[PDB]
Structures are given as C-alpha cells and as structure tokens.
Structure 1
Amino acid sequence: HMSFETRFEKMDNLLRDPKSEVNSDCLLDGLDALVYDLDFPALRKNKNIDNFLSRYKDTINKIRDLRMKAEDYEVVKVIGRGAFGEVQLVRHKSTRKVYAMKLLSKFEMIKRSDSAFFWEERDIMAFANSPWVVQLFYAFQDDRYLYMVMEYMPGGDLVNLMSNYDVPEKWARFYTAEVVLALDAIHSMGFIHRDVKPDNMLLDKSGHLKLADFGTCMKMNKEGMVRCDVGTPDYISPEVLKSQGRECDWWSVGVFLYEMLVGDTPFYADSLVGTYSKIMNHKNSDISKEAKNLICAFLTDREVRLGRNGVEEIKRHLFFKNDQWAWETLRDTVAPVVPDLSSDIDTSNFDDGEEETFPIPKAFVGNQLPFVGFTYYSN
C-alpha cells in the first residue's frame, strides 16, 4: 500500500515515463483519435457525441496545430519505399536539422490484418541507444499516416554497395562481423529480427553499419525461443518454416555472406517456390577455405548450425582472423568504404498506382484506435 504524497509522485512518473503506454503524449493521442473517429455526420447525430465534438472542436484543433505535424518537414527527396509507405529524406523547417522520415499508411496497415507490428520497431529504434541500431527521434501521426523521424544514414544500403563493387574477402569479413555485433545487440534486448538481409543494412557517414528496419522483430521469451506465426524469400530459415503449424537469424547471416562473395542467392531460382524448396534441401542444394566453411556452418539445420551455442562461438571462427581489427574495437576502425558526401543531404547512395483512404463510416468503427500511443518526442 502506497500513500498519498506518494501515489501522486508515482503518477507524475507515468505522466512522464515515456515507456508508459499512458505517457502524457499517449493520452493526447487518445483524445485526438477519438475526435477523428467521431466527427462524422451520421454519428454526430448523437447527443453525447455532438456535444463532445462541439466542446473539443476549438481545443483539439489548437492541439493538432501545435504538436508535430508533417507540415513541419520539407521533403528533399524520396529515398526508399516500404510495404505501407515511402521513406523520404527531410529537413526540419524550424530547426534546419536533417532526418529520414518513414511513412506508414494507416489504411493499408488496416486493410492487411498486418496491424500492431510497429510497436516493437518504435520501442527499439527509440531506446536501443546503440551504435548498431538506427535512432528514432520523433514519432507522430495524423488521420492518414504514422511518421517515424530518424537518424539519416548517408551511407546507403548494402544492396547498392554489393551492386557497385567487386567485394573482396576483406570487406566481406568486415560487414559480416559488424552485422554480427549488431544482431547480438538486438538479441541482448531480448528480440529476434527474423528478417536479416542487405536491404535492411545501412551505413553512417563513416561507412559503418546499423540496422534500419525492425518491423519483423519479435520478443523472445525466457527460454530464448519463440512460438511463431514469414519474412523474405532468398534468405529465410527452414527451422522456423515448420513451427507455423533465434539461430534462425544466423542462418539469414550465412545466406547474406554467400550473396556477397557470390553475386547471387545461395538458393536463387527463377520461380520463387523454387527458391523455397531449394532452401528446404539445403543439404544438397576465388573463394577461401574459411569463407566456404563458415557459410556451410551457418547454412545447416537448426540443431547443428553455427551459433547454436554462443555468439562468442561465432566470433572465434577461423574466417574471423585478421591483423586489422579486434571485436570490441571494430566500431572505431576504418570502414572498408567511406561515403564521399557533397553536403548534409547527398542522396547519392540511393538510386533514383498510388494510395486511397478509409470509407466514411455509418457507425463507430474506431479506425484510429490501433494507433493511440504512437506519439513520441525525444526532446
């Protein structure tokens, strides 16, 4: 039993505790949402509602206007496209600061039952506080989209990179190993990524690596494993392809490595289903002895796969031997490729029908609800 003077402080806590589902900004998100989901001709016909909307008209419009809205960002150039919206480079009008804003169509997010997945991604990007993980500075929302303002990566994706260069075993060793420190960072936070791939790997102005998408992430329980409900084709791990009715990330890894030295998927197939079964037959489906080894050590069945035991076990692998870097020093050494940037907005490492809207309801559908609590300020 707490006391008065106590309970009050304790409550101010929550009203400030940004990990709280009911941080002040989340309550405001609630009032906001509610006013959205209510201001419709049909519904306003109700005493209670119309009275409400008539009382929080002025006030809530004031709010909308003050809080962060998309009108606050100048969009320099679209630099990417996810499933539910586009990622565009931006500069804050009032602050002049430059971020990368990922967009999310509330609609598309509802149409597909693919809702409530971005919570893990928000949390991670906003509190991982890690050199390995992209940092979220702001997250806000209107009627149409979610917005995630985040540390811009001038470096570009590992995809563009592998496109442009004849990757040597050196580089390979570098990028791979960093991906390993990062994935271990994630797992330390008690999450599993489930989608490891070049498309998700970005680079900071210094040519080092972070992880840039976390939609796939899933919280792993006490025993370190997960009850699972896929992700990608060219990479995916079989052991998790049967639970449908951790070390999996490591599989994805090996796949990537192969892709990097080779120039194509370790189980590429013109037909996709082909790539699928081909991964199921992994056992039977220029380079160094070690490269080969390592790869095939990851590319094995769950229980005999490389990394089943400890991450350290992976670190120590022979292919991870050199006279150019140590592990807890890698982050600070000279990247294999460093980006030459003309300004704070060089979209050079990023190469070059539409969308609809929700239908006016006849009754309360509350389409804003799955989104209350998404607003986050970093100060």
Structure 2
Amino acid sequence: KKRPEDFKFGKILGEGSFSTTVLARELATSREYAIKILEKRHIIKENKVPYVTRERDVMSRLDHPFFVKLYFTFQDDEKLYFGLSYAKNGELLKYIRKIGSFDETCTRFYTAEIVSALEYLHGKGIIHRDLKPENILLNEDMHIQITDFGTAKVLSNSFVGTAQYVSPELLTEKSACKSSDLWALGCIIYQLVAGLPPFRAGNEYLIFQKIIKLEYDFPEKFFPKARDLVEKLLVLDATKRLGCEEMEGYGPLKAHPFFESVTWENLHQQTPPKLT
C-alpha cells in the first residue's frame, strides 16, 4: 500500500477544480506514474463522490492497451491518489495543431486505434461520454491511451460533455448511449482530416444550434472514403450510426472501405506512421 513518501513528485501534467495530475517517480523502482490527486473536501462539497467512485471502478475493469491503466490507489487525510500510466507524448490535440491536419495514412491508423478501443469499451457496457483529442493521449511509442473516465456511464440523462463533440440526442432527448461516443468519433475523424472540429461557432449555444441542424460541411479535398465514413457517423438519428447495435455493432464499422488496408488484430504492435 503506497504513500506520498514513496514518490518524488515532479511536473504538473494537468490541473482541474482542486485536482492535479503530477508526474511522479517511484523511489523503489524508478518507474514513472502520472498520479491524479483529488482533494476529498472539494469532492464532498461538490457532490462528486459518485463520479470519483465511478472513475476508479471503470478504470479498474479496463485492461486494454489503448486505455490508461490504474496501477494503484491510496489516500491521506486530505487527498485521494490514483497511480495511472504515464503517456509521455501528451494529447493527440497537440499533434493536430502541430502538423495542421493528418495525411490519409495517419488518419487511418489513429482512427483504427480509436475504433478498436471503443469496440472494447463498448463491449464492456461502458460509454465514455466526453471523447475528444484532449482525452486521447499518446504514449512513448505513439500509440493512443484514452483517459478521463470520471464522467463515463456504466450501462444497467445527467452529464453532457465538451460542446463541440456533443451529439444531437443529448441536446434533444437527454439520452446517452454508445452512439454518443460514435458521434464524437465522427467529429474526431473530421478533425484529423480537416484540422478542426466540424461544428464551430462563437459560443456553446451557437454550436449546439448547428449540431442539431447538422450544419457543417466538408473541405473540398477531404479524403473521399473518410468523408463517407464521417457521413455515416454524423447522423442525427442515433440508431442509424455505423457501429451501433441497431446497425449490428463494430463489424460493419470496421469493414468500412476507409479501413480496407487495416489489420485490426494487433494494432498496438504495429509501428505507427510518422506524423507528417
């Protein structure tokens, strides 16, 4: 059972509320962990116990190379500590801004990884509900590591995620499902190819308003097969989105022509394409 004193804490990787992810090195092992630290007081005052509890519970059930791993938890008088894998290369968003937009080979590889992680997550009855390039981290090897499970839902209303990636049914029926993540997936693919997300406006109200009207368009040289896939994910009716249960799940989504050359079986052992 580990304690703060077992680690040399280093730089802050991110900050929330009263919250911090800190890079830490374990003294006994020299291993690096990204340690999420949460102030018990603020969790209690903000009624966030079900959320923090859900986060720990979902991450404990996840055992897949495209997800951040929970190695350990501990707590002191003030704080909860979660020891998480450390993704050295940061946010996918960093790479989208840096190189502007991805070529076709890079879009295909990283979409396939995300599709493959979703298949696993959805197969466990878990929906992410806030999927976005900020939450899709990159490891030392440039493979994805998805994170941020505080707001996830374990299937047996309430939380709406980041505006640009919100699906119409969330704005209209207060309902969330696996197709909510598939919508975010279409927004991410568009964002990889185009360099920016599809629904953009001056404020949230205006973005929500475009989302429910399906008011976006494709730039002229958008990869034709990627556009076709995006058009089958960005569908207002959540039961007609490629990848969902009503459309027979991941098999048809993975068979999409955009993925023709993908070997789905061992993506995390394939060498990723160089980002431009």
TM-score by length of 2: 0.89
- After TM superposition, list the pairs within 5 Å mapping 1:179-190 onto structure 2: 179-190=114-125
Question: In 2, distance between residues paired with 1:198 and 1:273?
Answer: 22
Question: In 1, distance between residues paired with 2:120 and 2:133?
Answer: 18
Question: In 2, distance between residues paired with 1:88 and 1:110?
Answer: 22
SS at match of 1:156: coil
Superposed displacement of residue 295, structure 1:
0.8
> Which residue type is aligned with residue 332 of structure 1?
Q
Matched, 1:234 2:168: no
Q: Name the residue aligned to 1:358.
A: none
Q: Name the residue aligned to 1:216.
A: 151
Q: Name the residue aligned to 1:300.
A: 235
Structure 2: gaps spanning 5 or more residues: none
SS at match of 1:268: coil
On the 8 A contact 1:229/1:243 being kept in 2, the answer is no
Superposed displacement of residue 234, structure 1:
0.8
- After TM superposition, list the pairs within 5 Å mapping 1:188-267 onto structure 2: 188-221=123-156, 230-244=160-174, 246-267=178-199
Matched, 1:171 2:106: yes
SS at match of 1:210: strand
SS at match of 2:80: strand
Superposed displacement of residue 204, structure 1:
1.9
Q: Deviations over 1:138-195 (max 9, x none)?
A: 1111222211111211122101111211411210111111001101111111111111
Which of 311, 316, 329 pairs up with 2:250?
311
- After TM superposition, list the pairs within 5 Å mapping 1:124-139 onto structure 2: 124-139=58-73
Q: Deviations over 1:254-301 (max 9, x none)?
A: 001111211222111112211111111116672121111111111112
On the 8 A contact 1:283/1:300 being kept in 2, the answer is no
SS at match of 2:235: coil
SS at match of 1:103: strand
Q: Name the residue aligned to 2:270.
A: 333
On the 8 A contact 1:196/1:249 being kept in 2, the answer is yes
Question: In 1, distance between residues paired with 2:162 and 2:14?
Answer: 18
SS at match of 2:259: coil
- After TM superposition, list the pairs within 5 Å mapping 1:25-174 onto structure 2: 67-166=1-100, 167-174=102-109
Question: In 2, distance between residues paired with 1:244 and 1:304?
Answer: 18
Matched, 1:279 2:211: yes
Higher relative contact order (Cα pairs below 8 Å, separated by 6+ residues): 1
Superposed displacement of residue 229, structure 1:
5.3
SS at match of 1:117: helix
Structure 1: gaps spanning 5 or more residues: 1-66, 222-226, 339-379
Question: In 1, distance between residues paired with 2:23 and 2:216?
Answer: 44
Question: In 2, distance between residues paired with 1:146 and 1:154?
Answer: 23
Structure 1 segments of 4 or more deviating over 3 A?
A: none
Superposed displacement of residue 97, structure 1:
1.9
TM-score by length of 1: 0.66
Residues 321, 134 of structure 1: CA spacing in aligned structure 2 closer, same or farther, 3 A cutoff? same
Task: Please tell me the root mean square deviation across aligned C-alpha atoms, in Å.
Answer: 2.0
